[PDB]
């Protein structure tokens, strides 16, 4: 069980303040799940302020779907994401 | 090709 949330990261002057992990065909971050996950959130950064949490599974970035994605596809999505990053996540309870 | 646990940081 869990919930889906869409968080909006408002970038400031210190970067997004997250790390992402996982992806199809590489070592799973969590169990045998090959999804993209949030593996780090900087405490003082804008992702923390928006409400993103470690362990959130990343479903979309600015509406671009990442279900079944390889790691580099999520990296590319975040690189292109701009000043306000809308991040749809699944948060296991 | 990167292998293992892939983690990419956006500081």
From Swiss-Prot, chain A:
Residues 6-93 form the PDZ domain. It is found in: Cell membrane; Cell junction; Cell junction, Adherens junction; Cell projection, Lamellipodium. It comes from the Eukaryota. The modification Phosphoserine is found at residue 42. Expressed in kidney, skeletal muscles, liver, lung, breast, intestine, placenta and skin mainly in epithelial cells (at protein level). Ubiquitinated; targeted for UBE3A-dependent multiubiquitination in the presence of high-risk HPV E6 proteins and degraded. Scaffold protein involved in different aspects of polarized cell differentiation regulating epithelial and neuronal morphogenesis and T-cell polarization. Via its interaction with CRTAM, required for the late phase polarization of a subset of CD4+ T-cells, which in turn regulates TCR-mediated proliferation and IFNG and IL22 production. Plays a role in cell directional movement, cell orientation, cell sheet organization and Golgi complex polarization at the cell migration front. Promotes epithelial cell layer barrier function via maintaining cell-cell adhesion. It is linked to Neural tube defects: Congenital malformations of the central nervous system and adjacent structures related to defective neural tube closure during the first trimester of pregnancy. Failure of neural tube closure can occur at any level of the embryonic axis. Common NTD forms include anencephaly, myelomeningocele and spina bifida, which result from the failure of fusion in the cranial and spinal region of the neural tube. NTDs have a multifactorial etiology encompassing both genetic and environmental components. Interacts with UBE3A. Interacts with PAK1 and PAK2. Interacts (via PDZ domains) with VANGL2. Interacts (via PDZ domains) with LPP and TRIP6; the interaction is direct. Interacts (via PDZ domains) with TJP2. Interacts (via PDZ domains) with APC; may mediate APC targeting to adherens junctions of epithelial cells. Interacts (via PDZ domains) with TSHR; regulates TSHR trafficking and function. Interacts with ARHGEF7 and GIT1; interacts directly with ARHGEF7. Interacts with CTNNB1. Interacts with MAPK12. Interacts (via PDZ domains 1 and 3) with MCC. Interacts with DLG5. (Microbial infection) Interacts (via fourth PDZ domain) with tick-borne encephalitis virus RNA-directed RNA polymerase NS5; this interaction targets viral NS5 to the cell membrane periphery and nucleus and prevents STAT1 phosphorylation, and thus, the activation of the JAK-STAT signaling pathway. Interacts with HPV E6. Interacts with influenza A virus protein NS1; the interaction results in the translocation of SCRIB from the cell membrane to perinuclear puncta. It comes from Homo sapiens.
Curated annotation (Swiss-Prot), chain B:
This is Rho guanine nucleotide exchange factor 26. Activates RhoG GTPase by promoting the exchange of GDP by GTP. Required for the formation of membrane ruffles during macropinocytosis. Required for the formation of cup-like structures during trans-endothelial migration of leukocytes. In case of Salmonella enterica infection, activated by SopB, which induces cytoskeleton rearrangements and promotes bacterial entry. Interacts with ICAM1 and RHOG. Disulfide bonds: none annotated. Isoform 1 is broadly expressed, with highest levels in liver (at protein level). Certain mRNA species appear to be specifically expressed in prostate and liver. Induction: Certain mRNA species appear to be up-regulated by androgens in prostate cancer cells. It is found in: Cell projection, Ruffle. The lineage of its organism: Eukaryota, Metazoa, Chordata, Craniata, Vertebrata. The chain holds residues 42 to 52 of 871 of the full protein.
């Amino acid at each position: 069980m869990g919930e889906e949330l869409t968080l909006t990261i408002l970038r400031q002057t210190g970067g997004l303040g997250i790390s992402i992990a996982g992806g199809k065909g590489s070592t799973p971050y969590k169990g045998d799940d090959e999804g993209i996950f949030i593996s780090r959130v900087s405490e003082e950064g804008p992702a923390a302020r928006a409400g993103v949490r470690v362990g959130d599974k990343l479903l979309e970035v600015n509406g671009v779907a990442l279900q079944g994605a390889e790691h580099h596809e999520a990296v590319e999505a975040l690189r292109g994401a701009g000043t306000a990053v809308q991040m749809r996540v699944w948060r296991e309870r | 090709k990167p292998n293992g646990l892939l983690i990419t940081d956006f500081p």
